[PDB]
Amino acid sequence: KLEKFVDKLPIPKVLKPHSKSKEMTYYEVTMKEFQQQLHRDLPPTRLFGYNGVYPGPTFEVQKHEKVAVKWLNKLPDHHFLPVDHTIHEVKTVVHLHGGRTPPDSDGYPEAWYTKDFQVKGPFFEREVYEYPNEQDATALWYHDHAMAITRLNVYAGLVGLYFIRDREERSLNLPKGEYEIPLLIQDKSFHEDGSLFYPRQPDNPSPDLPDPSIVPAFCGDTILVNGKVWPYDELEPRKYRFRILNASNTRIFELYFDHDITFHQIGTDGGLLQHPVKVNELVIAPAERCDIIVDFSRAEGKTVTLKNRIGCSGQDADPTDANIMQFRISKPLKQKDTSSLPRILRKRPFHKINTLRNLSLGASLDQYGRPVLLLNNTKWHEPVTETPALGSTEIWSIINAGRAIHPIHLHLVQFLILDHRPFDIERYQENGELVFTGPAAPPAQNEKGLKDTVKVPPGSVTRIIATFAPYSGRYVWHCHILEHEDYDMMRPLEVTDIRHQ
Amino acid sequence: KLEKFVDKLPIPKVLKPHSKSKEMTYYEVTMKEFQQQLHRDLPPTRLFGYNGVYPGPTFEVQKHEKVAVKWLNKLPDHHFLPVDHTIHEVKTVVHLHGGRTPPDSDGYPEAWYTKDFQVKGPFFEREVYEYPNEQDATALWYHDHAMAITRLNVYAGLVGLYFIRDREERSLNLPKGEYEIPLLIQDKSFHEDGSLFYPRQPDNPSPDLPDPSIVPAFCGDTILVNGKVWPYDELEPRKYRFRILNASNTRIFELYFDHDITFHQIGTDGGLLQHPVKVNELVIAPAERCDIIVDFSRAEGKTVTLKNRIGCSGQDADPTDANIMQFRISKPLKQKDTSSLPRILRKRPFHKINTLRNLSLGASLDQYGRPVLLLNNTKWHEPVTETPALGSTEIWSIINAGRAIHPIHLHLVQFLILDHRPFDIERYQENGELVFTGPAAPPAQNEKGLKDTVKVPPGSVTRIIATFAPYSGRYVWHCHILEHEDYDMMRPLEVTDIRHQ
Ligand SMILES: [Cu+2]
Ligand SMILES: [Cu+2]
Ligand SMILES: [Cu+2]
Ligand SMILES: [Cu+2]
Ligand SMILES: [Cu+2]
Ligand SMILES: [Cu+2]
Ligand SMILES: [Cu+2]
Ligand SMILES: [Cu+2]
C-alpha cells in the first residue's frame, strides 16, 4: 500500500515572530486541529498541529537571543485518539527538548492547559514562555508534553523544529541555505480513511481490560519525513547538511545509504563534535538528533535511497519500513560548492564528581495485567528522589534489566556518555546486586559529544556524567518512548540551590 | 603473599639463527624442562619452555625472509600438569599464531611429536618448518598446539614472541630499540612449592567424574608480564612502543593506566592501522595483540601502574589481579626523543564475496555431565565442513548463544570485523532461526585493522569477512580459550584449489 517516492520532501517554513526588539523576540504559536494530505494517494489526515501545519513551523534563534513564545491552545474539547482514562480532554503543554530553559518555561507535564487556558494543570503558572538561549549552537525540537497523553499529542502531529546558531558554527563554512535540509523522520499507520490509526487496546484485549488501554509499544508501518510519506528530493551533486531527528513514539532507526556513500557526522543532541566522524550507519533512537554532512559530488545522475536496516523489534526491516526517502541527484549544480567539511569543529572542550546515582529500568504489572514501565521501580506520583544540587557534577548509572533498549532523556542539561557494561540479570532480580559480567565499552565515536538522550542497551549499565546547571527548580527525566513515558517511566528532577544550609 | 612490583621487567632475548644465507635463515629451538624463578619470593617453578627460558626467545624476521625453524622436543616422558585421558604423554607441535604459513608448517594439532620424534601424530610430515613471511609487518607469537593438551603445554610455559618487520613500518619513525617493549601478559596460580597450580578436576567432582578432568575455564590469581609476577620497569620520560599480547588460557583483560595517560593504538593482530586511535582502555582477549604508543614525556618522576579493570567472569577486578605491572618514570632522558607518532600509518587499504557461512557457538553435555563447548554443535572428530575455495572472499556469521565472550580465531588468514548484532536467544534454541533483536554495531575504532582473533559477544552475531589465500590445504579454526579448544571448540578448515572442474 502507498507507492513510495511520489511526493516531494517538504521543508517546514521558518516561523516569523510577531515582534522583535533588542530586548526580546516574541512569538505566538497556536495549536489547531486541521486536515493535511500526507501522501499523494491518501485522503487528508486529521491532525493536531502548531500553526495548522505538520510538522510545526521551524524556529531560527541565536545564542543569547531572549526568545518569548506564547503557546496558545485552540484544540477541541475531545481527542480523536484513544485516551486511556485509567493511567493518571485535550491537555497541552509545550516542551523545548534539549533547551537550557528555566523550569517555569520548560513545559512541565502537569503544567498543561486546555483551550484558551480555561482549565489549567496543578503546576500551571505562565502563558508566555521565555527561552534565554544561553547554550551553544545545536538542533533542538519542540513537542507536546501533557501528562498521560504525551504519546497521543505528539503522534497527533504536535512536533516542530528549533535551531540555535553560534558564531562558532557559522565560522565553519558548512552547507547552508537550501543545502541544509532537516530530516524529521517519523513512523505512522493510516486507515483507509486517511486518518491516523492508534490502537485502543493491546492485541487480544481481555474483557475487564480498560477501554481504551495504553499499549507498551507502538510503531507504524509507514515512514514519514517532514510530514510526507516516503518522500523524494532532487539534489545537486555537492555537499549537503542533514539535520536528522527521530520523532517517532518508539521506533529506533538504523539509517544507511544504498550506495557507497558515507555520513560525516559533525554534531549530536547538544551541539558540534570536536572533529567529523565518518560513519556508515546511524542508529537514532526517539528524540536523538544527528548533524551529518553528505557528499553527492561523485553521484550526479544516481538515485540514492536513504534506507533503514531494522524493524520495530530490531529484526530485519521489511522492504517497506526499510525505506526512509529517496534522493535523486538530478538538479544541475547551480554555483560551485564552496562549503566546507573542516577537520576541527569546536576547539573548546566539552570535574570533582559530587554525587553517584544508581537508577534501574524495569517494569511491574498493574491490576489489569498491563506492564507498568518504571524508573527505580517508582511511580510518577511518588516523592522526588533525583535531587542534584545546583552546579553539582554527577555520574548516573542507568541499569537496564529489560529486554530492549530504553532511550533515557534528561531535561535541562546536556551530558556525556561514559561507557556501557553488561551485568548479571539473574543476580539483579533476586538480590538487587549489580555484578558485572563483561568489559566496559565506550560509546561509539559519533556519540562522544553532548547529548540529552542515550540508548541504554538491554542487560547493560549505561553511565553518563552531568552537571546540573545553571537553573534550579523542578524538571523531569524519563524514557523517550512515549508509550513508556506515559505509563509510567517518568520521574521528577529537582535541582536545588544551596545557600544557607 | 607475593609483594607486587619487586622484580624488574624481563625482556626476552632475540633469537640468533644457527645459519643465515641469501636463500634461507635456519633456526633450531628445543623444548626443555627446567626451573625458573618467577617472583622474588617464590621458589623456582618447573616449566616447559623453548630453549630453556620462559617466555621463549623472540624471533626478528623480515618480510620476504624465508625463515626455517626445526622445533625439537626434549621434554620428559611425563607431563607435570594433570592430563585428561578421556577427552580425545607429552605431545608437542609449534604453531606460529597469525603467520601466513603453508599447512605443512602451520602446526596442525595432530601433527604432534614426542621427544626426538619418537612417536609422531597421524598428520606428521616434517621436522623443519618453513615460514615464507610474505605478509606485512605485525606482532605474531608461537606456542604449542598439540591436540587435547594445548591448554597444558601453553600453560606450562611454551609461548614466545615473533615479530615481522616492513619497509613501511620502518619508514614510520616509531619508538625502537629499548623504547619498544613487548608486554606478554599472562595469569597463573602457584603452590607454596613455587610450582604451577592447575586443577585436576572441577570444584565439586562426583566419583563418576574422570580423574583428572578438564575444566571449562581456568584463570590464575597472579598476573605475569614477560614471565615475571607483577613486575616493574624504570623508564625515561618519552614515547614508548608497547607490543601487548594476551597469552592467558582464558582471562580477558581490560587494561588502563591509573594516571590520565592515553593509549595511542597503531596496530592490531594483522599489522598497522591506517591512523592512530586514542583509546583509554584496551580490551584484550587471549591471543589478541595491540600495538600501542604511550607518551610518558609529561610523567617525569611519576609512578604509572598498568591496571586491569575486570576479573575472571567480567566482574570488578580484585585489587590484586587489577594490577598488571608498574612503570616508574625515573630513568633520566638519555637522548632527545626523536621518535614519531605519525598521523598516517598504512596509506594502502586493507571483493566479490562468494560464500556465506553461519557458525554457532554452544555447548553440550557428555556422559559425565561435563560441558562440551562446540563449533556448529560438531565435534572435532567429525568430517570437515568449513571448506572455502582458494582465493574466495567469505562473510562468516559467528552466532554466540553462550553466556560469555568467545575469542574465535582463524588460521592462515587475517580478517576484518564487519559488525556485531544481538539476536533472540530463546528463539534460537527452539527452531534454530536467527531473529535479530537490535541494531547492528561496528567494531570499536581500534579493532578495525587486520585481525585473526575476534571477541564474539554473548547473545550476538559477529560478522567477519576473510579472503582465504594464498595457500591451500588443511588448517583449523577455534576459540582461543584453551580450556574450550581442547574440549572441544576446534574444527578443521580446508582451503581447496580449483582449476579443472
Ligand atoms: Cu522530547
Ligand atoms: Cu526534554
Ligand atoms: Cu522505555
Ligand atoms: Cu521530557
Ligand atoms: Cu594461537
Ligand atoms: Cu593460530
Ligand atoms: Cu570459547
Ligand atoms: Cu590455533
Author numbering:
A (entry chain A), B (entry chain B): 2 to 89, 97 to 358, 362 to 512
Authors' description from the paper:
Laccases, also classified as benzenediol/oxygen oxidoreductases with an Enzyme Commission (EC) number of 1.10.3.2, are multi-copper oxidases having 4 copper atoms arranged with oxygen at its center. The 4 copper atoms are termed Cu T1 (where the reducing substrate binds) and trinuclear copper cluster T2/T3. Laccases have been shown to catalyze the oxidation of phenols, polyphenols, and non-phenolic aromatic compounds through a free radical mechanism, where the enzyme facilitates the transfer of electrons from the substrates to molecular oxygen, resulting in the formation of water and oxidized products. In this work, we present the crystal structure of a CotA-laccase enzyme derived from Bacillus licheniformis ATCC 9945a (referred to in this paper as Bli-Lacc) adding to the growing database of CotA-laccases.
